[model samples]
Target chain A: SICSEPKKVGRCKGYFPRFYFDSETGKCTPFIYGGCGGNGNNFETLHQCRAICR
Target chain B: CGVPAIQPVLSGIVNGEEAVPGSWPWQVSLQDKTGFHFCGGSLINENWVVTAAHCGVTTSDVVVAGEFDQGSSSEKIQKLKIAKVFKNSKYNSLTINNDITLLKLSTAASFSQTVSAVCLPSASDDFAAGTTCVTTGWGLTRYANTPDRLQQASLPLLSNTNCKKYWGTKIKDAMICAGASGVSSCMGDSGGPLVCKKNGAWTLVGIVSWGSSTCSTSTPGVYARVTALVNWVQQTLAAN
Candidate 1:
């Protein structure tokens, strides 16, 4: 459900590797997470983002 | 698309949202010697880019990349030395008329997933009022912080008369307007492409000319109406 959200790197302070589902491109894209809360579009890995969104 | 391709085009992340990386393959970042995006344009062919004359085209080269992750070195980005810059002979900075310019790359671009040309609309091609279209760009100015990724938004067409209700006499026959919706749906960073999808191909309808320097729904983003000036573009490309 959160797969449609945009990739927001969060507001906090650390840069962690993550992935996001870009509904238009239909692929899981990599982004840097801010070590804070994000939506369902934010995934721990490319595979995780694709499994639910793709 | 300027050239035949198998993929579909992508729209916003609008409200000045980030575009799906290379969905707008023709979206270009024009940079000066400092290596930052100062303006945006559209690649119409292998070596040709169309932009706004008001941008001045002082940028020495153009960077075309699909994936704009600023930290990544592998983002399919291509830079070409500008062999020449052509501003419309009748361009006026005050009135913003004929606010169009063309960039000639020193060498033809290699078409790929990240870089491709966009198709131009025929002079006779006309889409009625309220037609949905799309516009893309990087930033309006450096003060905006100029994000690493490009932005896109969908805009609906506005008639010259309906648009006249807002800008008055400054809105001329050679200009086009979009984003009739009260929200600022289109981000026009001086020199960018205002396009529409016709027959499954994204056709260049107008060139980002003048409008709000900042976000404002009170006025729609105006463009250099390309329908009337397609001849100028076609002539320039052919004669060159």
Candidate 2:
């Protein structure tokens, strides 16, 4: 249970990561959406964001 | 009862509790090119900044990162590449339920002593209410009337039941609860940490979501509960 990393994107996976709030975007995007959907090849969580709700 | 702090977003360990510039985990206050006010964020990874989505855009190339003075400062700032701003579709400003956002820099922000994200709580952690947690922001230090430099303080975590009772009917399912009588989040302190510990790990369970019109009285601080969306967070990251 301690090693389980929460999910923030993708379908229901029994656990999700928190969506860190962004000031410029004005929305909460989950970290699991790190680098997908042709949004860009960049995974942002490895930068300044976290994968949690609070 | 399934949330503990996750891996470091910006830095690995949150060692100090100070809120001064370049001290502890600090949030910044920045003005857009239009002079509109919004809070700047810290790095948790190479590209993302954890911040509140409420800081609307006026357009500026340099995204201020760490600047701590009594008010303003000739400080260390990050000139970021405007990559993308990620906002939650569920967030409603009127309700203040979803108050989070992620900023992707066009270029990766290099890890330094002054920048990093707070560690996230895991899904299995149990941060019981009434425990002491610290919040730091560059906003007002008191009510709408108080003005102070960036600072920090310890507040007690209030139970969700009591928090909802105090907030009455306005409290909704999208929020978490924290804070107590003598200590409350005031203006300028939005989208900051409400951190506590369990099993020796410090977990960020709340992001100073909202409160009454003022920071006075027994108004409990409500936060965005991180534990509630553990699965969604992982899948989101995985899908991307």
Candidate 3:
């Protein structure tokens, strides 16, 4: 539900968080994310971010 | 790998004066073995920079990112060792054709307000003449003179037809021309990004390849069009 909800982080340029699934660290970590122009690796929430992470 | 949070309107002085700090965060100073500034480059990602193929020195080199003034030392500057250099396979020295290269950093660059990745033009992206573009570097103010601080200048793009008339057959399809009105990228500026603001975001459109030997504004400056190399750049990064 957290991932499905619309939200915004002040630090984030857009209406989504820059959290991404990190296979190296096995956690969703913050990364450089502009409001637009980011890759598909980014996620909006921790649960959903980690659900499919390697 | 992506754009930073910081965004500012584009503006600059003339003939390569001191640039405002954090203005062109993607700008990086490339140095030769003797620790002397030789060329400029743009950070396309944390580990990759785009430059000119002609600048791949036969010796060791260094890349300094987040640098504002070469004379002043700051906490923002990150001096990194290069891991590998990738010059385009088709690069030609005699004619300066296909003059593009990619530098892979030994370590990831710490992106900040003063150092970040510039947006690369996507495939099928088209920029027309008369579009205002900007180039920044620590190039010479005059013949055989280098500047202490970074410099930036705004120059409008020129049509390929007009560029051909000025430079003749040397202008190739892989190249685009800019700054034919007495303002242009000069010596020590080789391999720098030719950026243009599109959709309120600055995108790299070209890499400074070659220009008139005299650095005259009367002759249009030639640049290796980034659009032509985007696929190669992406594939190279993916492989590396």
Candidate 4:
């Protein structure tokens, strides 16, 4: 489940935050990061993800 | 399982008390290049001491066993060089999960009345919540200054379910929580031992990993469960 303004953040692959850029909404949404090979889609913070996509 | 021929006197005290010399024979100080005691560990064998992964992986790191006071006596200390370091592959610094590690000594520590190996629990061994365990280190008595002499405290283990209320899902199965009502391990105590006496012999149950920021808070101190990683320890020792 992708969350905009997620109530909680989750970690994958050694507690790294999972993030993805939602180009449709021009927002960064949190994902259950698979912990490997997520590409530029992964960001440490929501702000970073948003900057990369929005 | 290296049990000292003579056991130290057991005393009940809170907020960490000065430990008598040789009281914690297995306790070792993990030092850096400047010879500063930054973390604590337990001598599990002649050449191996268990610590925390967050303590850093530096081959230059030194292990000083049988040390009660840092700058006091050289006769009681057995300073050894680190031959190698083995941090858990699954260790996650961000989550502090699997925060366990092992340091192999360049030379085996010659056991004395002031230095010995601590017994590791079998994989089947499980200490229940509320069991009284002893934690020792040169860590801060409170949260500020580091103590020169070793410090010891008695803490009661807490059930994982009970500890989860405070830490949430951050608490993993490989971790064990202990301490209550302001009694807990603090800074500089990382990689120390959380030992419990079972069947008249003390066993290394956990390694001091992390805890609440406020040392006086009721939040319990978390540790890496030793029993859960017995095979890992053995296999690592055998392979290396």
Instruction: For each candidate, give the TM-score of chain B.
Output: 0.89, 0.77, 0.93, 0.95
Q: Which candidate is the best by TM-score?
A: 4
- How should the candidates be ordered by lDDT, best one leading? 4, 3, 1, 2
**DockQ, in order, for the candidates?**
0.02, 0.02, 0.01, 0.03
Best by DockQ: 4
lDDT of 1 at A37: 41
* Candidate 2 lDDT score at position B42: 41
Lowest-sum lDDT 10-residue window in model 2 chain B: B7-16
In candidate 1, which residue pairs clash? B2-B117, B2-B118, B13-B17
The 10-residue segment of model 3 chain B with minimum total lDDT is B5-14
CA RMSD, predictions in order: 14.3, 15.2, 20.1, 8.8
Error of 1 at B188 (Å): 7.2
lDDT, each prediction = 0.69, 0.50, 0.73, 0.74
User: Sorted by DockQ, highest first, which candidate order results?
Assistant: 4, 2, 1, 3
What TM-score does each prediction get for chain A alone?
A: 0.82, 0.26, 0.52, 0.53
* Candidate 3 local lDDT, B1-240, one digit each (tens): 234354444454125556677778898888866677878889988898888876664337888898877888664699878899988898776666777889999899998778888899887899999998888887777643457787888888988899999878988888889897657676678788788888877899989877765567677888898888888899999998
Off by over 4 Å in 1: A1-54, B2-14, B65-67, B140-143, B182-188
Pairs in steric clash, model 3 = B53-B100, B182-B217
> Residue by residue across A1-54, what tens digits does model 2's lDDT show?
211233323211001123445445544444422111112321335333333322
